[PDB]
Design a protein around this ligand. Sequence first.
Ligand SMILES: Cc1cc2nc3c(=O)[nH]c(=O)nc-3n(C[C@@H](O)[C@H](O)[C@H](O)COP(=O)(O)OP(=O)(O)OC[C@H]3O[C@@H](n4cnc5c(N)ncnc54)[C@H](O)[C@@H]3O)c2cc1C
Ligand SMILES: Cc1cc2nc3c(=O)[nH]c(=O)nc-3n(C[C@@H](O)[C@H](O)[C@H](O)COP(=O)(O)OP(=O)(O)OC[C@H]3O[C@@H](n4cnc5c(N)ncnc54)[C@H](O)[C@@H]3O)c2cc1C
Ligand SMILES: NC(=O)c1ccc[n+]([C@@H]2O[C@H](COP(=O)([O-])OP(=O)(O)OC[C@H]3O[C@@H](n4cnc5c(N)ncnc54)[C@H](O)[C@@H]3O)[C@@H](O)[C@H]2O)c1
Ligand SMILES: NC(=O)c1ccc[n+]([C@@H]2O[C@H](COP(=O)([O-])OP(=O)(O)OC[C@H]3O[C@@H](n4cnc5c(N)ncnc54)[C@H](O)[C@@H]3O)[C@@H](O)[C@H]2O)c1
Lengths: 458, 458
Amino acid sequence: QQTIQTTLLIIGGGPGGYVAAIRAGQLGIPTVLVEGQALGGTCLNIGCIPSKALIHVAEQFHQASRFTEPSPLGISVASPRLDIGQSVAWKDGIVDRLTTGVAALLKKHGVKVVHGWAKVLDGKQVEVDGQRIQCEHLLLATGSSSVELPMLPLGGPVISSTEALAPKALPQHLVVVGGGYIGLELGIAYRKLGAQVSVVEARERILPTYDSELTAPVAESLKKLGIALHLGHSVEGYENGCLLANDGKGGQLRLEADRVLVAVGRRPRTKGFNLECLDLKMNGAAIAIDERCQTSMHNVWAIGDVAGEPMLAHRAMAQGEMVAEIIAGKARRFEPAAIAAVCFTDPEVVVVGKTPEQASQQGLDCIVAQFPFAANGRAMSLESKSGFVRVVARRDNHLILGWQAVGVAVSELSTAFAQSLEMGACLEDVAGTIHAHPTLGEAVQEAALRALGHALHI
Amino acid sequence: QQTIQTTLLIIGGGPGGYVAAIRAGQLGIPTVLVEGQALGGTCLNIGCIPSKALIHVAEQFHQASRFTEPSPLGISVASPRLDIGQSVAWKDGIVDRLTTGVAALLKKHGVKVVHGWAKVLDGKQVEVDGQRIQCEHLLLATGSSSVELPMLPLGGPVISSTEALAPKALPQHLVVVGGGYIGLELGIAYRKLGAQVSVVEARERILPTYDSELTAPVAESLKKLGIALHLGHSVEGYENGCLLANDGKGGQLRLEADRVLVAVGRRPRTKGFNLECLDLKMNGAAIAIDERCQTSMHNVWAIGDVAGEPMLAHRAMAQGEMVAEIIAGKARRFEPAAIAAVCFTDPEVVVVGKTPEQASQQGLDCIVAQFPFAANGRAMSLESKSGFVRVVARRDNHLILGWQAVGVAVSELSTAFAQSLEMGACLEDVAGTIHAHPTLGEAVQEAALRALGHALHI
Ligand SMILES: Cc1cc2nc3c(=O)[nH]c(=O)nc-3n(C[C@@H](O)[C@H](O)[C@H](O)COP(=O)(O)OP(=O)(O)OC[C@H]3O[C@@H](n4cnc5c(N)ncnc54)[C@H](O)[C@@H]3O)c2cc1C
Ligand SMILES: Cc1cc2nc3c(=O)[nH]c(=O)nc-3n(C[C@@H](O)[C@H](O)[C@H](O)COP(=O)(O)OP(=O)(O)OC[C@H]3O[C@@H](n4cnc5c(N)ncnc54)[C@H](O)[C@@H]3O)c2cc1C
Ligand SMILES: NC(=O)c1ccc[n+]([C@@H]2O[C@H](COP(=O)([O-])OP(=O)(O)OC[C@H]3O[C@@H](n4cnc5c(N)ncnc54)[C@H](O)[C@@H]3O)[C@@H](O)[C@H]2O)c1
Ligand SMILES: NC(=O)c1ccc[n+]([C@@H]2O[C@H](COP(=O)([O-])OP(=O)(O)OC[C@H]3O[C@@H](n4cnc5c(N)ncnc54)[C@H](O)[C@@H]3O)[C@@H](O)[C@H]2O)c1
């Protein structure tokens, strides 16, 4: 079998990879992508789309479940049933349509996609199931993997995200080790589907990265939903039919769980393929990269999760397309104004830009203003799930530094938050924009009116 | 009873009125508001909040109704029941909380609110149930009323928006004369609640203000939903238990309906109170106003629906606050970049800024690009209801002139569309902003990438 020889070789075919490919095919750089498993990556096959699609079928099961009890809406139904086989078959069709479509556009722009795992040989060649492949620029987009707990190997009963996104039956009591977006999005969805759920988390609170003002609405819904919340506890074992966790000094807890879901973090995928043969500078578990996504070895490039830093899909998609353009001549440098973060928890949290905390750390004097959804008509049409919108701005020129929001159907305000920040808006431009009634985004205009000293509905 | 004497007198206590009040109380102008009926106006009591809240309970009844038939989601329920008394009681609580809150803020900023109808005496005094009231600036915010059909007086069986927002029972077959947002939002909601529905409309198509590219998704859902659509027909009568409509030359149609809902338009409220005693220039059925919302009689001001022009709440709210600031000294002029329009139809249409049509009329050369939701992951998690996002930009400097979108849960993209337009964004700034995955607003970044020549998922 003979040498394939290209200009751009990309290791990995998830978000970062297939968009570095598609734009390099588009820009006309000879490109080849290696992909061990299936295209789209973690996002399309066992992340992004299958989680948000399970969350949706969990929401529709929950909403027809509440109508067995009296509601102020006057709707009543008997016998809500969920046999998750079909929920999963549904989920799988969607993943299918989307991987298919990524092949189509990779064919369309003509990049050669070779399957099998790639063992690196040097910063120029690679061996994929026998055939060597050489290139001028190597782009690594190997991704990330889930951290395993030493006394709690995955296997059967201990599943990770990947298997939680794939039941053939649902648990009687599921325990969730880790109270970050993966644990919470999955825990809430397991509870609405009908399983009992407890979240065990080793810090003060759920979503410990985020302040308590913001995170507090989510906590209250888990507590409303019947999801126990053993904070301050760390997990030490699972004595066959029972889980044991301890709180630091001396606390107990024997939770009889028959499914545990470790969702304790994500590590850069740097091992198992010969990355170690190369002189690459590191940043903990991840490859160090400069603002041009290049490693310490010249024509080697890293993007997405392997570069650690914020581990999200749109970050990878946006580093891929930028690398592609730099190799093709265009002068670029990844300095976004912010990378929007969204958690599809009930309620949803959205953080885009600086939090108050962060603004203080960097030594800024801030106007921080908030407008709640209980004073919002749209929110009330929607049975609310109260939270608020918060704005953070420079007290001297009102240049907005960040945006955070908590509430029902808030995820789509992120588009607005990100673009206002990409443009360099001040509170004034946001406040002085007519926002349409009745929408949840009226709260964004009012949270900016309040910072300025003149809100109308609070 | 004695002369109340103020600086600013406001006739009408709906959106335009109570925000002209609240900001004039805030700015400290002696202010009094007259209000015949109840605060908040048409929006809060018989428009905005009660329609969107009935649409929501119709959505929850429909979604638990579909689960009697097989779904790919695997959820099943028996016996969906809706006795609308409770849906309406629910609706009424929300309207209640919101009117209450408007009183609170009007008390808080100390404006005197006097009830009863006001008969104008001159452009300075008014008589409200006996007591005269004088002032320096008169602001009229009398609103709008629904056009009645001459051979079809309202009464019983012929209801208008106001009574459709208030059943004690639902119709067996409801016919809807008018296929604009009121008729369609209400028709779809009557159908999901379980009533049979036909829309009769005198033009080529549903939402005749809007182009067929955009409006076509809605049409297809009405047709999917079982809502008959007699376009080209005009209504001539209702022979007690049957409706008759004709199509222009000679066509028939005898629809046996036992409820008809005329939703044939909205007229400025200029009559019934002595507005006619004043020298005001007109613009058809509405008061003519300049960019400072002032009438042809100096310290007389008009806002909202009485000024006709686009008949929407956020327009009124934003004219109110601007008048208040002009009277208090600040130099202003209402020239928004656009007034966002939203229809809570299934699917939702959102138009913000220039349509292609409009851009051609004004003689502009345009890039018009579109990105659909079938190529969008978020849309698929959501069972889609496919439509697209469209962008319109100047072919010479890519300055964005407008934004339109059709689809499920699209209403919240309006915040983004409006602010990007208020800032003067070009396609580039939108496209070069990291949008979060998986959201419906990824379609907004891609529709801008496509206009530029380089989209990634289409
Ligand atoms: C449950 C879950 C939910 C998530 N939800 C969200 C979300 O909603 N939004 C968000 O932004 N982020 C979310 N993420 C983020 C996460 O999906 C990443 O952001 C995204 O997958 C990163 O893409 P990447 O470029 O690093 O590659 P990955 O998708 O990790 O894929 C890299 C690919 O490289 C392949 N590979 C690696 N080495 C080789 C080799 N040497 N040879 C051949 N093939 C190889 C792998 O098989 C893999 O498919 C989620 C993650 C999880 C697990
Ligand atoms: C069913 C329906 C749905 C709607 N939905 C939307 C929507 O979702 N979004 C949107 O933007 N628009 C919507 N509208 C728009 C519409 O509500 C107007 O935009 C809004 O109500 C306009 O406010 P306004 O200032 O003109 O006053 P109005 O709300 O019309 O109220 C004016 C007030 O003046 C009072 N009044 C008049 N004359 C006197 C007098 N001489 N003395 C004392 N009192 C008097 C009246 O009693 C009235 O309450 C909807 C309308 C309807 C009917
Ligand atoms: N790991 C990284 O370097 C990194 C970087 C950026 C973003 N992230 C995000 O993290 C995701 C993977 O995990 P996550 O969503 O849970 O986030 P995470 O890594 O922030 O959270 C893991 C949670 O588990 C908790 N925990 C640890 N050990 C525990 C134990 N033994 N018992 C109980 N609780 C324990 C931790 O305090 C933490 O709250 C990735 O998809 C990515 O989006 C990770
Ligand atoms: N009337 C105005 O000057 C004006 C201005 C701006 C916006 N609007 C909006 O219109 C709303 C009120 O009505 P709408 O939503 O139906 O909008 P609309 O006034 O645009 O639509 C009324 C519809 O009924 C149709 N029609 C007229 N007579 C008919 C008949 N006899 N038989 C069958 N069809 C007939 C018309 O073609 C039209 O499509 C207001 O709340 C406002 O938001 C009105």
